[PDB]
Design a protein around this ligand. Structure first.
Ligand SMILES: Nc1ncnc2c1ncn2[C@@H]1O[C@H](COP(=O)(O)OP(=O)(O)OP(=O)(O)OP(=O)(O)OP(=O)(O)OC[C@H]2O[C@@H](n3cnc4c(N)ncnc43)[C@H](O)[C@@H]2O)[C@@H](O)[C@H]1O
Ligand SMILES: [Mg+2]
Ligand SMILES: [Zn+2]
Length: 217
Protein backbone atom coordinates (compact mmCIF):
# COMPACT_ATOMS: atom_id res chain seq x y z
CA UNK A 1 0.00 0.00 0.00
CA UNK A 2 2.05 2.90 -1.39
CA UNK A 3 -0.03 6.05 -1.17
CA UNK A 4 0.14 9.83 -1.56
CA UNK A 5 -2.44 12.29 -0.16
CA UNK A 6 -2.56 15.43 -2.12
CA UNK A 7 -4.68 18.44 -1.27
CA UNK A 8 -4.69 22.13 -0.65
CA UNK A 9 -3.95 23.42 2.84
CA UNK A 10 -6.80 22.23 5.13
CA UNK A 11 -8.24 19.57 2.82
CA UNK A 12 -8.04 17.02 5.61
CA UNK A 13 -4.92 15.09 4.73
CA UNK A 14 -3.74 14.63 8.34
CA UNK A 15 -7.30 13.91 9.58
CA UNK A 16 -7.56 11.15 6.95
CA UNK A 17 -4.05 9.92 7.48
CA UNK A 18 -4.78 9.15 11.12
CA UNK A 19 -7.70 7.11 10.09
CA UNK A 20 -5.77 5.32 7.27
CA UNK A 21 -2.90 4.50 9.60
CA UNK A 22 -5.17 3.18 12.32
CA UNK A 23 -6.82 0.85 9.81
CA UNK A 24 -3.89 -0.22 7.65
CA UNK A 25 -0.68 0.20 9.83
CA UNK A 26 1.52 1.85 7.18
CA UNK A 27 3.66 4.76 8.28
CA UNK A 28 2.34 8.34 8.02
CA UNK A 29 5.03 10.56 6.38
CA UNK A 30 3.99 14.23 6.59
CA UNK A 31 6.77 16.52 5.38
CA UNK A 32 5.03 19.45 7.12
CA UNK A 33 4.90 17.51 10.44
CA UNK A 34 8.61 16.55 9.96
CA UNK A 35 9.56 20.15 9.43
CA UNK A 36 7.50 21.38 12.38
CA UNK A 37 9.12 18.80 14.66
CA UNK A 38 12.56 20.08 13.64
CA UNK A 39 11.41 23.67 14.15
CA UNK A 40 10.16 22.87 17.70
CA UNK A 41 13.63 21.27 18.39
CA UNK A 42 15.26 24.37 16.81
CA UNK A 43 17.65 22.13 14.87
CA UNK A 44 19.44 23.53 11.84
CA UNK A 45 16.98 21.83 9.48
CA UNK A 46 14.18 23.36 11.55
CA UNK A 47 15.48 26.85 11.42
CA UNK A 48 16.07 26.50 7.67
CA UNK A 49 12.54 25.35 7.04
CA UNK A 50 11.03 28.00 9.42
CA UNK A 51 11.78 30.88 7.26
CA UNK A 52 9.69 29.40 4.42
CA UNK A 53 6.89 27.75 6.51
CA UNK A 54 6.09 30.79 8.62
CA UNK A 55 5.55 32.80 5.40
CA UNK A 56 3.36 30.27 3.65
CA UNK A 57 5.98 29.38 1.02
CA UNK A 58 7.24 25.95 0.05
CA UNK A 59 10.51 24.72 1.50
CA UNK A 60 12.97 24.29 -1.34
CA UNK A 61 12.88 21.07 -3.31
CA UNK A 62 16.36 19.84 -2.65
CA UNK A 63 16.11 19.69 1.18
CA UNK A 64 12.56 18.38 1.05
CA UNK A 65 13.40 15.60 -1.38
CA UNK A 66 16.33 14.68 0.83
CA UNK A 67 14.26 14.26 3.96
CA UNK A 68 11.87 12.03 2.03
CA UNK A 69 14.69 10.00 0.39
CA UNK A 70 16.07 9.32 3.88
CA UNK A 71 12.67 8.61 5.41
CA UNK A 72 11.63 6.11 2.75
CA UNK A 73 14.86 4.13 3.25
CA UNK A 74 13.61 2.91 6.67
CA UNK A 75 12.39 -0.61 7.11
CA UNK A 76 8.90 0.51 8.26
CA UNK A 77 8.23 1.56 4.59
CA UNK A 78 8.93 -1.88 3.05
CA UNK A 79 5.23 -2.90 3.05
CA UNK A 80 3.72 0.48 2.34
CA UNK A 81 3.62 4.14 3.28
CA UNK A 82 1.38 7.20 3.34
CA UNK A 83 2.95 10.39 2.08
CA UNK A 84 1.01 13.47 3.10
CA UNK A 85 1.74 16.77 1.46
CA UNK A 86 4.62 15.40 -0.58
CA UNK A 87 5.15 15.77 -3.49
CA UNK A 88 4.09 19.44 -3.71
CA UNK A 89 5.87 20.22 -7.01
CA UNK A 90 6.49 18.37 -10.29
CA UNK A 91 10.20 18.27 -9.45
CA UNK A 92 9.38 16.48 -6.19
CA UNK A 93 7.12 14.07 -8.02
CA UNK A 94 9.85 13.25 -10.62
CA UNK A 95 12.32 12.71 -7.77
CA UNK A 96 9.86 10.44 -5.94
CA UNK A 97 9.43 8.38 -9.14
CA UNK A 98 13.17 7.74 -9.15
CA UNK A 99 13.24 6.92 -5.40
CA UNK A 100 10.56 4.47 -5.75
CA UNK A 101 12.09 2.83 -8.76
CA UNK A 102 15.31 2.42 -6.71
CA UNK A 103 13.32 0.77 -3.93
CA UNK A 104 11.54 -1.52 -6.30
CA UNK A 105 8.23 0.01 -5.42
CA UNK A 106 5.45 1.74 -7.38
CA UNK A 107 2.89 4.38 -6.22
CA UNK A 108 -0.44 2.74 -6.19
CA UNK A 109 -2.73 5.73 -5.60
CA UNK A 110 -2.34 9.49 -5.53
CA UNK A 111 -5.43 10.70 -3.79
CA UNK A 112 -6.51 14.30 -4.41
CA UNK A 113 -8.74 15.32 -1.55
CA UNK A 114 -10.66 18.09 -3.18
CA UNK A 115 -12.16 20.90 -1.17
CA UNK A 116 -13.04 24.36 -2.52
CA UNK A 117 -10.97 27.24 -1.29
CA UNK A 118 -13.81 28.99 0.49
CA UNK A 119 -14.25 26.01 2.79
CA UNK A 120 -10.46 25.73 3.31
CA UNK A 121 -10.22 29.24 4.48
CA UNK A 122 -12.95 28.61 7.02
CA UNK A 123 -11.40 25.34 8.24
CA UNK A 124 -8.09 26.89 8.94
CA UNK A 125 -8.80 30.33 10.16
CA UNK A 126 -9.43 29.83 13.77
CA UNK A 127 -7.20 26.77 14.27
CA UNK A 128 -5.28 26.88 17.59
CA UNK A 129 -2.69 24.36 18.87
CA UNK A 130 -1.77 23.29 22.40
CA UNK A 131 1.80 24.22 23.17
CA UNK A 132 2.15 21.15 25.46
CA UNK A 133 0.42 18.19 23.80
CA UNK A 134 -0.21 19.46 20.25
CA UNK A 135 -4.03 18.82 20.43
CA UNK A 136 -5.85 21.01 17.94
CA UNK A 137 -8.81 23.28 18.59
CA UNK A 138 -10.87 25.65 16.44
CA UNK A 139 -12.39 28.88 17.62
CA UNK A 140 -15.50 28.42 15.58
CA UNK A 141 -16.02 24.68 15.25
CA UNK A 142 -14.21 23.09 18.24
CA UNK A 143 -13.41 25.68 20.88
CA UNK A 144 -11.78 24.75 24.18
CA UNK A 145 -13.72 24.97 27.44
CA UNK A 146 -11.67 27.90 28.56
CA UNK A 147 -10.44 30.30 25.90
CA UNK A 148 -6.65 29.95 25.15
CA UNK A 149 -6.33 26.75 27.28
CA UNK A 150 -6.25 23.13 26.33
CA UNK A 151 -8.89 20.92 27.84
CA UNK A 152 -6.57 17.94 28.27
CA UNK A 153 -3.63 19.38 30.20
CA UNK A 154 -4.25 23.05 30.74
CA UNK A 155 -1.52 23.94 28.31
CA UNK A 156 -1.61 27.36 26.61
CA UNK A 157 -2.93 27.41 23.06
CA UNK A 158 -1.37 29.39 20.22
CA UNK A 159 -2.00 30.39 16.62
CA UNK A 160 0.63 29.08 14.26
CA UNK A 161 2.53 31.80 12.47
CA UNK A 162 1.07 30.43 9.17
CA UNK A 163 -2.64 30.05 10.17
CA UNK A 164 -3.69 33.71 10.09
CA UNK A 165 -6.00 34.61 7.21
CA UNK A 166 -3.42 36.36 5.08
CA UNK A 167 -1.00 33.48 5.33
CA UNK A 168 -3.69 30.92 4.66
CA UNK A 169 -4.67 32.86 1.52
CA UNK A 170 -1.14 32.81 0.44
CA UNK A 171 -0.64 29.10 1.12
CA UNK A 172 -3.77 28.44 -0.93
CA UNK A 173 -2.46 30.48 -3.84
CA UNK A 174 1.10 28.90 -3.78
CA UNK A 175 -0.27 25.38 -3.66
CA UNK A 176 -3.01 26.00 -6.16
CA UNK A 177 -0.44 26.99 -8.67
CA UNK A 178 2.02 24.20 -7.96
CA UNK A 179 -0.68 21.59 -7.73
CA UNK A 180 -2.14 22.22 -11.24
CA UNK A 181 0.75 20.62 -13.14
CA UNK A 182 1.22 18.06 -10.40
CA UNK A 183 -2.34 16.81 -10.84
CA UNK A 184 -1.60 16.69 -14.60
CA UNK A 185 1.55 14.67 -13.92
CA UNK A 186 -0.28 12.00 -12.03
CA UNK A 187 -3.36 11.99 -14.23
CA UNK A 188 -1.02 11.17 -17.13
CA UNK A 189 0.38 8.28 -15.08
CA UNK A 190 -3.17 6.99 -14.39
CA UNK A 191 -2.61 6.92 -10.62
CA UNK A 192 -4.65 10.09 -9.78
CA UNK A 193 -7.86 9.43 -7.75
CA UNK A 194 -10.27 12.13 -6.72
CA UNK A 195 -12.08 12.20 -3.37
CA UNK A 196 -14.71 14.77 -2.42
CA UNK A 197 -13.31 16.25 0.81
CA UNK A 198 -16.50 18.25 1.45
CA UNK A 199 -18.15 15.50 3.42
CA UNK A 200 -18.02 14.53 7.09
CA UNK A 201 -14.69 13.03 8.21
CA UNK A 202 -16.03 9.53 8.34
CA UNK A 203 -17.51 9.67 4.85
CA UNK A 204 -14.36 11.06 3.28
CA UNK A 205 -12.67 8.12 4.95
CA UNK A 206 -15.22 5.60 3.53
CA UNK A 207 -14.63 6.97 0.04
CA UNK A 208 -10.86 6.91 0.50
CA UNK A 209 -11.12 3.39 1.84
CA UNK A 210 -13.03 2.34 -1.23
CA UNK A 211 -10.20 3.57 -3.42
CA UNK A 212 -7.72 1.72 -1.01
CA UNK A 213 -9.78 -1.55 -0.94
CA UNK A 214 -9.87 -1.42 -4.75
CA UNK A 215 -13.68 -0.97 -4.92
CA UNK A 216 -13.83 2.33 -6.82
CA UNK A 217 -12.67 1.46 -10.36
N1 LIG B 1 6.52 18.74 0.08
C1 LIG B 1 6.79 19.96 0.61
N2 LIG B 1 7.60 20.76 -0.17
C2 LIG B 1 7.81 22.01 0.34
N3 LIG B 1 7.39 22.53 1.48
C3 LIG B 1 6.63 21.75 2.24
C4 LIG B 1 6.31 20.46 1.80
N4 LIG B 1 5.51 19.82 2.80
C5 LIG B 1 5.36 20.76 3.75
N5 LIG B 1 5.97 21.96 3.38
C6 LIG B 1 6.11 23.15 4.21
O1 LIG B 1 5.43 22.95 5.41
C7 LIG B 1 4.26 23.75 5.44
C8 LIG B 1 3.07 23.01 6.08
O2 LIG B 1 2.81 21.88 5.24
P1 LIG B 1 1.64 20.78 5.69
O3 LIG B 1 1.92 20.40 7.10
O4 LIG B 1 1.66 19.83 4.67
O5 LIG B 1 0.33 21.70 5.71
P2 LIG B 1 -0.95 21.78 4.73
O6 LIG B 1 -1.21 20.49 4.10
O7 LIG B 1 -0.83 23.19 4.11
O8 LIG B 1 -2.03 22.08 5.71
P3 LIG B 1 -2.65 21.28 6.96
O9 LIG B 1 -1.69 20.30 7.44
O10 LIG B 1 -3.29 22.25 7.89
O11 LIG B 1 -3.89 20.55 6.24
P4 LIG B 1 -4.38 19.06 6.16
O12 LIG B 1 -4.80 18.86 4.73
O13 LIG B 1 -3.48 18.14 6.85
O14 LIG B 1 -5.77 19.16 6.97
P5 LIG B 1 -6.05 18.78 8.51
O15 LIG B 1 -6.27 17.41 8.55
O16 LIG B 1 -4.95 19.33 9.31
O17 LIG B 1 -7.42 19.49 8.81
C9 LIG B 1 -7.41 20.87 8.87
C10 LIG B 1 -8.71 21.38 9.56
O18 LIG B 1 -9.94 20.94 8.89
C11 LIG B 1 -10.76 20.12 9.74
N6 LIG B 1 -11.38 19.07 8.98
C12 LIG B 1 -10.77 18.01 8.48
N7 LIG B 1 -11.57 17.21 7.80
C13 LIG B 1 -12.80 17.79 7.87
C14 LIG B 1 -14.03 17.51 7.21
N8 LIG B 1 -14.16 16.38 6.62
N9 LIG B 1 -15.02 18.38 7.47
C15 LIG B 1 -14.81 19.54 8.07
N10 LIG B 1 -13.66 19.88 8.72
C16 LIG B 1 -12.63 19.04 8.52
C17 LIG B 1 -9.81 19.64 10.80
O19 LIG B 1 -10.44 19.32 12.05
C18 LIG B 1 -8.86 20.81 11.02
O20 LIG B 1 -9.33 21.80 11.92
C19 LIG B 1 3.90 24.18 3.99
O21 LIG B 1 3.12 25.38 3.86
C20 LIG B 1 5.37 24.30 3.54
O22 LIG B 1 5.94 25.54 3.98
MG1 LIG C 1 -1.51 18.28 7.61
ZN1 LIG D 1 -2.72 20.09 25.61
Amino acid sequence: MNIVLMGLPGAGKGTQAERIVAKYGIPHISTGDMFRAAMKEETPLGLEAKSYIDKGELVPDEVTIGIVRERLSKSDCERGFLLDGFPRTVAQAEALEEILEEMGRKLEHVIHIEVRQEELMERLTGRRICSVCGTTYHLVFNPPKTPGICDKDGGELYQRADDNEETVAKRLEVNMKQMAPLLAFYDSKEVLRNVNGQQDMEKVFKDLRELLQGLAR
